[PDB]
Structure 1
């Protein structure tokens, strides 16, 4: 839809006041581009907290998955957006969501050494023994990266 595409640009750009008007006019929150990214996906990636909260209040799918199976929590966790990770998990985001590679939000958080996010995901019941297509855990990633702090947290 016309407004659905306008909401995608607004959510990405972090234009809080435009998103406010679009939610009032009823811009489709399940609007998706060619790669299957919702306004929530974009907000989570670019790290726009207020818009993440406003979209979830306006009945956005917290477990919306792109054409490669990635959710907003995947993007939030990977790019170190602690507050968005918390807000998503509180609104019922699948903490053990596997993409098409078998990669979880814990894997992505571990790979970028986001200690706070890892502990938040573990608190909300992230499967620490969860393996990707290469049979790798978040621990295997921490050892390979040489992250001694993270290696300790996952033990």
Structure 2
């Protein structure tokens, strides 16, 4: 695509809300990808920049872009406890049961970090509570392993 592309990836990374709006208006590829396959939406999700997330989605950012290891922006938001980003992604059509290359789902990741509000929203949007990763493990196994009785409650 573009040199504006690289600039949009850098701006989304560093949270620069304005420079993102400008580069957008100038036709930067919204789905430009860096070397590990992260798009601006990945970068804004990982680093918790809610407004950049919203702006990119209004501009046609692919909500289910996957990096070179199969991970989606929802995986990153869910793993890093960015609740409002998780909500926005799910409203824009994020695949709630997306699996990475290891069979890991956004529910597995939120569960392993004990991000309970996120776990709830995932389950609200149809997260498969019995989805297994490559080692056979469910979110429930993850709760038992980590000794998180509050999460074990919720997932029954």
TM-score by length of 1: 0.99
Cα deviation, 1:76-120, whole Å, max 9, x if unaligned, reads: 000000000000000000000000000000000000000000000
Q: Distance in 2 between matches of 1:135 and 1:146?
A: 18
Instruction: After TM superposition, give the deviation of residue 148 of structure 1 in Å.
Output: 0.5
Q: Distance in 1 between matches of 2:88 and 2:124?
A: 14
Q: Distance in 1 between matches of 2:125 and 2:34?
A: 30
1:2-151 map, 5 Å: 2-151=3-152
Q: Distance in 1 between matches of 2:36 and 2:110?
A: 22
3-state SS of 2:70 partner: coil
Cα deviation, 1:107-152, whole Å, max 9, x if unaligned, reads: 0000000000000000000000000000000000000000000000
Instruction: After TM superposition, give the deviation of residue 50 of structure 1 in Å.
Output: 0.2
Q: Distance in 1 between matches of 2:116 and 2:109?
A: 11
3-state SS of 2:78 partner: helix
Instruction: After TM superposition, give the deviation of residue 66 of structure 1 in Å.
Output: 0.3
3-state SS of 1:134 partner: coil
Structure 1: runs of 5 or more not aligned: none
Instruction: After TM superposition, give the deviation of residue 52 of structure 1 in Å.
Output: 0.2
Q: What is the alpha-carbon root mean square deviation over aligned residues?
A: 0.4
Instruction: After TM superposition, give the deviation of residue 33 of structure 1 in Å.
Output: 0.8
3-state SS of 1:136 partner: coil
Instruction: After TM superposition, give the deviation of residue 154 of structure 1 in Å.
Output: 0.3
Q: Distance in 2 between matches of 1:98 and 1:39?
A: 20
Instruction: After TM superposition, give the deviation of residue 47 of structure 1 in Å.
Output: 0.4
